[PDB]
């Protein structure tokens, strides 16, 4: 769908992530000199000694479909969670008047990839004009910084080693 949309033009609307630590950073997703992350993604972790329940609403007033790219975080040890998200069992929920999808993180041990043994799951939600987006997590939320514009047009994507 991102291929068929043919445009990564990003609106950067701002959320109020009050009570948790914004802009995350991993040594496996470094930005030049030190740690860094995904440009279009926000990594939230405890405030200081806690992780309150997040409830952010972000309506859509423009006349076009908005595409939200978010996700959840999966720690490696039952303590890696505690460590990050306080609660011992996260919970993420993204919905609209017509949508809704909820995810719980899976704690475990994956193979060692680029240092890290835990990882993230990427999801998407589109909200049609005249509907609101709602996020409600009490842990592991890897929130989005805004929406991608949605084109209809005539574009695609192809695997090819032919030089242009």
């Amino acid at each position, epitope marked *: 769908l991102v291929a068929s949309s043919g445009t990564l033009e990003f609106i950067t609307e701002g959320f109020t992530w009050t009570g948790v630590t914004q802009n995350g950073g991993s*040594n496996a997703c470094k930005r030049g000199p030190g740690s860094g992350f995904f440009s279009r993604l926000n990594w939230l972790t405890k405030s*200081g000694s806690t992780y309150p329940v997040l409830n952010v609403t972000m309506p859509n007033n423009d006349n076009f479909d908005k595409l939200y790219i978010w996700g959840i975080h999966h720690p490696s040890t039952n303590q890696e969670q505690t460590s990050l998200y306080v609660q011992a069992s996260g919970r993420v929920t993204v919905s609209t008047r017509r949508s809704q999808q909820t995810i719980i993180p899976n704690i475990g041990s994956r193979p060692w990839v680029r240092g890290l043994s*835990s990882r993230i799951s990427i999801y998407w939600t589109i909200v049609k004009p005249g509907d609101v987006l709602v996020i409600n997590s009490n842990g592991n939320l890897i929130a989005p910084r805004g929406y991608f514009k949605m084109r209809t047009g005539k574009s695609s994507i192809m695997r090819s080693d032919a030089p242009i």
Partner: antibody
Amino acid sequence: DVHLQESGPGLVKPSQSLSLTCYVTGYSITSGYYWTWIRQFPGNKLEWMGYISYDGSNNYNPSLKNRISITRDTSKNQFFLKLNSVTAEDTASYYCAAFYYDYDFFFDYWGQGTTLTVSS
Amino acid sequence: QIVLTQSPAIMSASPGEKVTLTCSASSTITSSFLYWYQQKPGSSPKLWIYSTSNLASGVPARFSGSGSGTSYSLTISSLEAEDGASYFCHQWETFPRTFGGGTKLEIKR
């Protein structure tokens, strides 16, 4: 979670052999984590004595190999220390612990710690 | 052979000041193999910061965290009776794990 209990004599005379013991509970010391021994001197100075991971008879001790020597007992799920020939210089607080390690994350467990005193 | 040297070694401040411990190092260490421990008397070092800048499962906000080359840091927004202790920066780069001394912390009273 996992628990660890130090153990052994409260003292010994310069020269004999020291033989600590840690009892873990809640994780097969063969399932990850680097079981180590760490002590600090009267001056309150933490000094890393070395480990032995799930990796087996690895040990991969420090820079005082000469005697820091370690074991594990997968059955009893416990690991030990030796340190062979000791002095009074060696009297201190002996602790045992496990570390996690990840490139982005870290996390340990220690212990009540046992005091050994080396003197005549 | 890594050479970590925390600076004040013994020092004080007041309930509200901006306290800051440092910790150099023989050679250079990658920004995720340096940590800090907060030990109080009668306890056992308690972890306080992993990967150079992340607070462990309990540590309060007032505690920032930093470090780049052969030089690191700690830092406290304010300072609380409670925050009064000694700290040791730990390293995990090269194999003989090191700690260096530590920086004690008495307070203003």
